[model samples]
Each structure stands twice: as structure tokens, then as C-alpha cells.
Target: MVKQIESKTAFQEALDAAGDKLVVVDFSATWCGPCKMIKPFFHSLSEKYSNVIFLEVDVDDAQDVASEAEVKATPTFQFFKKGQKVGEFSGANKEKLEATINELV
Candidate 1:
């Protein structure tokens, strides 16, 4: 399932809960077109990879989380393992996203 995080507190909690599992966080906004385009793919990936935790953070609603992650662009995909950030990608595209996740997994 794709989880929605609304604050820095929740974001941290997600990371903590993920532990050694891969946590895929998509930082996006409602107004972003590319964000919308990639959201469905993310959801599909979430379903495909049941072991991975997928989270969506609205940049406008969770500004603190975005700032903490140093995300300057919309639709930023960050990967975390055991609460530590391991990889990230900006923008949206199915191939690149899948490749990144595959590499990390």
C-alpha cells in the first residue's frame, strides 16, 4: 500500500518502522503534473513489492519533511534502508524508477 505522510513526525516514524526494509518515499505536490503521472506507477510498484514500504508526502502539506530531506524539486523519489537514506532520484519516469529500486533491492 501507498502510505500518506503529513508531517515530519510521521515521516520519521515511517523510517523507524521500515527498519532494514527498503522505504520508498515520493515527495510530491497535488499541482505537479509529473507527480500525478508517476503516482499510479508508484502505487503499482507498491503492490508488486509487498515487502517495501511506499510513502507519499505532499510537499505543501509536509514542508518540514521535504526540507529535512533537502528536496528542491517536485516528484523526488528517495530510498531509505534502516532509517538511512541510500538513494534518490528527481523527476518521473517508469524505467529509471524501476532501475533505481532494482539496484537498491
Candidate 2:
């Protein structure tokens, strides 16, 4: 339900293609337990919020993109609109995650 960003270029293109739409980027790692737990929830949000573009950036696979995004923790969610970062948070809490999306949507 989310596009996997495998490279810095792909990540940039995803954001650029999103244009003025809301883009929710999930900065995650395969070894992170929290990331594994929240992965399903993140995917669900993509389907639920059809208008939003959901992207998954594997910190291990796309370290450059992770560094560019300033991800300091696993499961860091960054919200972008109009190609600009609007908000961000780090956690695996479903309620807060959805709440943030609700406000943004």
C-alpha cells in the first residue's frame, strides 16, 4: 500500500511527483521492532487516505535518503506538502499516527 523508496533519486522523485498533495514518508528499518509493528498500520493508512501518497524509506537500503530526511529514529513519519516538509514525529503509536494524518488530511 506504500511505495518503497530504494534510492535517494527515487525518494526525491516521489516527493516531486506528489506535487501539492500530501506525502507521508515512513522512515523505517528492517531490524527495528517498532518499525515492523507499525508497518501494517502505515500501509493501512495509505489505503484509507486515498488522496495521500504514502512512501516507505528503508533506512538500511536508502541511507542517503534517510540522512537527507534527518531521520534519527526508526518509524519516523514525515509529512510533506507542496514539496516542503510540514510536520514530523517518531513513534509506533497508531492513535497519534492516525490523528496526525487526520489533521493533515
Candidate 3:
């Protein structure tokens, strides 16, 4: 299951817990259609890439975290390692998402 982030503190804890593992953060909002479409695929990826950590943050609920991550749009994907952002992409392209994860691993 994708861990749901409720606050910035939890986000930090998750990154710390992930250690050196690849962390894929899905910054999405309930009103976003594209984000809803990719939710399943993202969850599937969490299972497929067991080595990677998956997290979900509602832009509305976790506004602080969203702003801290500089999420200017819904469905922004951010890659993190050792509590630092490594890469990011803004979209809901399935192929690109999987490919990016593969490349990072």
C-alpha cells in the first residue's frame, strides 16, 4: 500500500526510514482526473518495485509538504533518497513513470 502522508513531519520520517532506498512520492489532489487515473498504476508499482518506497500526499491536506516540495501542479512525481529530492516529473504518463523508476534502480 502507498503510505499516505498527512503532514511534513510524517514525510520526513518516511524518508528517514527509507534510508538509501528509492522513494517515489505521488503528490496528487482529489480533484485531479489524471491523478485518479494513475492511482492504480502507482499502487501496482509499489508492489512491483518492493525495493522502492511509495508515498501519497494530498496537495490539499498536506499543503505545507506540497509547498516544501515545490509542487505547483497536481500529480507531480518526485523521487527522493536519503531525505533529499533526486528527481521529479509533472504528469501522469505510465510508461515514463515506470521507465524513470527502472532507470533510477
Candidate 4:
């Protein structure tokens, strides 16, 4: 299951627990159509890739995390390693998402 990040502290805790694994954060909002559309694919990905960690952050709930991550758009996917951001993209493009995960993981 994709973990839901509710606050900055919890996000940090998740980062700490993720160790050196690939961290994928999906920054989304309740009003975002694309974000809702990509939810299933994201969850499916989380199940498929046991080597990676998947997290969900609602922009409204974790504004600070989004600001710190510098997420300027909805449905932005940020890839991290060792708690450091390594890559990012903004969209709901399934193929591109799969390709990026394949490349990173």
C-alpha cells in the first residue's frame, strides 16, 4: 500500500525508515483530476516494486512538505535515494512513470 504522509514529522520519519531504498513521493490534492486518475497506477506500482517506497502527500494537509520539496504542480512525482531527491517529474503519464521507476529502481 502507498503510505499517506500527514505531516512534516511523519514524512521525516518515513524518510528515516526508508533507509537507502528508492523513495517515491506523490504530491497531490483532492481537487486534482489527474492526481485522482493516477492513484490506481501508483498503488499498483507500490505493490509491484518492493524495492522502492511509495508515499502520498495531500498538498492541503502537508503544505510545508510540499513547499520544502518545491512541488510546483499537482501529481508531481519526486524520486529520492538515501533521503535525497534524485529526480522528479510533473504529470500523470503512466508510461513515463513506469519508465522512470524502471530506470531508477
Off by over 4 Å in 1: none
> Over the stretch 1-105, how does candidate 3's per-residue lDDT look in tens digits?
468899999988999988888898888886678577788788688677777789989898889998888888777888898988788888778788888998778
For residues 35-83, write the lDDT of model 2, one tens digit per residue.
Answer: 6777678878766778778887889989999887778877788888877
lDDT of each: 0.81, 0.81, 0.84, 0.82
Best by TM-score: 3
2 or 4, greater by lDDT = 4
lDDT of 3 at 102: 88
Candidate 1's C-alpha lDDT? 0.81
Cα lDDT tens digits for candidate 4, 57-101: 989888988888788878788887888888988887877878898
> Which model is ahead, 2 or 3, in terms of lDDT?
3
What are the C-alpha RMSDs, in order, of all predicted structures?
1.4, 1.5, 1.4, 1.5
Point out where model 4 deviates above 4 Å.
Answer: none
Candidate 1 lDDT by residue in tens digits, 37-88: 7777886787788877899898888888888888888777888888888888
Candidate 4, residue 61: Cα displacement in angstroms equals 1.2
- Tell me the TM-score of model 4: 0.88
Off by over 4 Å in 2: none
